[PDB]
Amino acid sequence: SRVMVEGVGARVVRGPDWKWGKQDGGEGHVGTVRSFESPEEVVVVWDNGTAANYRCSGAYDLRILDSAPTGIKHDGTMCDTCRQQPIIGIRWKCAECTNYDLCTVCYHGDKHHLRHRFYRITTPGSERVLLESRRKSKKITARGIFAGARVVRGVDWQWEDQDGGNGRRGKVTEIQDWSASSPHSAAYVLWDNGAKNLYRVGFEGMSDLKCVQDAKGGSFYRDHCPVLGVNIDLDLEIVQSLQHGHGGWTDGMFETLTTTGTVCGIDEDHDIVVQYPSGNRWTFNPAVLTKASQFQVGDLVQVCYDLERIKLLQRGHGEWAEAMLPTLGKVGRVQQIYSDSDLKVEVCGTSWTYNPAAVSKV
Amino acid sequence: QIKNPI
Ligand SMILES: [Zn+2]
Ligand SMILES: [Zn+2]
Numbered sequence: 001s002r003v004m005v006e007g008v009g010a011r012v013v014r015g016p017d018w019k020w021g022k023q024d025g026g027e028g029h030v031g032t033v034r035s036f037e038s039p040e041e042v043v044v045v046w047d048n049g050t051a052a053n054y055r056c057s058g059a060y061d062l063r064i065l066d067s068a069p070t071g072i073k074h075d076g077t078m079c080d081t082c083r084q085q086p087i088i089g090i091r092w093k094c095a096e097c098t099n100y101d102l103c104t105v106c107y108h109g110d111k112h113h114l115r116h117r118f119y120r121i122t123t124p125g126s127e128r129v130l131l132e133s134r135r136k137s138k139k140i141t142a143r144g145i146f147a148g149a150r151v152v153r154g155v156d157w158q159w160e161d162q163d164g165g166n167g168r169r170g171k172v173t174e175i176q177d178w179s180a181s182s183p184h185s186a187a188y189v190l191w192d193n194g195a196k197n198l199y200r201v202g203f204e205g206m207s208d209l210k211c212v213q214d215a216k217g218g219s220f221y222r223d224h225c226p227v228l229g230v231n232i233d234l235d236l237e238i239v240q241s242l243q244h245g246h247g248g249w250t251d252g253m254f255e256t257l258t259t260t261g262t263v264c265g266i267d268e269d270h271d272i273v274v275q276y277p278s279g280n281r282w283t284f285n286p287a288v289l290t291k292a293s294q295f296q297v298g299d300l301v302q303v304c305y306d307l308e309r310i311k312l313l314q315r316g317h318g319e320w321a322e323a324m325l326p327t328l329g330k331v332g333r334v335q336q337i338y339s340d341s342d343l344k345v346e347v348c349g350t351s352w353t354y355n356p357a358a359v360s361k362v
Numbered sequence: 363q364i365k366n367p368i
Binding site: 020023041043050051052053054055 | 363364365366368
């Protein structure tokens with residue numbers, strides 16, 4: 001029979017039945033499953049340091065962002081984008097292709113076709129659950145202990161005065177695997193006193209670090225997460241072949257394959273220079289990158305006044321509403337550029353979510 | 363550690 005996996009070390013965010021205010025630090029903020037009081041109650045240590053108990057039965061206060069740190073894996077599968085084998089964590093199987101699967105990083109990282117609907121297969125014992133397409137689904141940003149985050153020692157700290165003392169601060173340089181069997185479970189920290197080391201952030205449900213300034217850890221399809229209880233659209237090898245004589249490839253760049261960077265610079269080398277929310281800047285062959293977005297916060301844009309097309313564009317991205325009719329042809333301001341490249345636009349006093357093709361720069 | 367009613 002199917003049974004619940006008490007996956008200590010799971011990286012989680014707030015769930016559908018959440019009613020505990022700002023304990024997590026806000027929606028999308030990440031925490032670590034420390035332990036299970038019972039099959040109905042779980043203890044989470046949020047990246048902001050707040051530790052608390054939550055419901056995981058009947059009511060569900062938590063969603064699983066990443067179970068990979070628990071070491072749970074689907075032997076006999078491979079992610080067809082990054083070639084992780086076995087898939088560790090949640091398994092995502094394309095329902096619309098023959099024998100195609102993604103890992104969590106690649107799935108939330110918009111690999112494969114966004115219009116292809118996937119099965120979620122949370123555990124080896126799980127029955128597969130057909131999802132809506134990513135292209136029509138809401139995407140929010142994860143926040144907490146990620147690259148660029150400002151941290152102090154956490155509750156499970158057992159590493160002497162490597163940080164220079166309790167309360168002394170450092171910067172998360174990179175999220176790493178504490179072990180091969182537990183990916184995405186550690187954070188490498190460069191302390192303000194020049195000391196540096198690797199610390200547990202999820203491994204065996206441990207929390208060695210605590211945010212004083214959380215950082216963005218990429219975006220995810222919230223409603224596709226199971227309850228507890230410029231871009232690069234080319235394969236790595238193609239990128240590698242293209243990067244020869246345009247900056248080359250190193251292993252510090254793996255962020256770029258699933259992370260949206262911003263074109264901060266061009267250069268005389270016929271090449272491009274891109275920064276990422278980690279703080280790193282990287283150089284590329286032009287053919288490696290694809291643009292979107294073409295907009296910036298503050299851009300004035302006119303809403304498309306072809307109703308057929310805006311209906312198509314909005315429905316295609318799961319954002320059509322008849323109440324949008326009076327916005328056609330109106331000029332508005334780009335308030336925010338979402339992670340799925342849709343635009344928060346302020347028009348008619350109100351704000352709406354637009355397919356970027358449904359507006360034109362003034 | 364916060365203790366929720368639950
Ligand atoms: Zn993958
Ligand atoms: Zn497919």
